[PDB]
């Protein structure tokens, strides 16, 4: 079917490269390390989503004046003024930022939050991108053994 649709559009022939994985057994030793647990990986991603949602509600309830990703000045947008928007911002930027979320928000120099927000970012870093990606990688390393 995909080979037939490739005539209507000469780009569905890219889906035929999936045959090197779902077809011949030359890649089983590599893909088996990922397909072995599977359930553990989706459960890990779900737990990560839950933890990021927890951090999102905490930030929405206690950190308003920090998410101010304005460009060129006086353009406050992409803030935490919406729960879904803040959750998407977290799950899309803070996870992939490589240094937690404390590097993509304003500087935590304000009173009443100087230490609370520092604890916030450092716990996000240590719980999301340190011990929740180490789990994802350990699930791949243990499958080989």
């Amino acid at each position: 079917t995909m080979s037939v649709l490739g005539h209507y559009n000469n780009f569905f022939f890219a889906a035929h490269l999936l045959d090197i994985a779902m077809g011949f057994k030359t890649l089983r030793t590599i893909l088996s390390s990922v397909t072995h647990n599977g359930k553990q990986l989706v459960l890990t991603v779900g737990l990560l989503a839950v933890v990021v949602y927890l951090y999102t509600v905490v930030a929405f309830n206690f950190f308003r004046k920090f998410y101010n990703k304005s460009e060129d000045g006086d353009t406050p947008d992409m803030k935490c003024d919406d729960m879904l928007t803040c959750y998407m911002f977290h799950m899309y930027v803070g996870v992939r930022a490589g240094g937690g979320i404390g590097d993509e928000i304003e500087d935590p120099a304000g009173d009443e939050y100087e230490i609370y927000r520092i604890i916030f970012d450092i716990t996000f870093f240590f719980f999301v991108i340190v011990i929740l990606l180490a789990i994802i990688q350990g699930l791949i390393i243990d499958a080989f053994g």
Partner: peptide, 20 residues
């Protein structure tokens, strides 16, 4: 005002050990 006083309040509890 809690960025500086937190460590002082944490260390103020060990005076009961310093007296002993």
């Amino acid at each position: 005002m809690t960025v500086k006083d937190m460590v002082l309040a944490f260390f103020s509890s060990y005076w009961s050990v310093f007296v002993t």
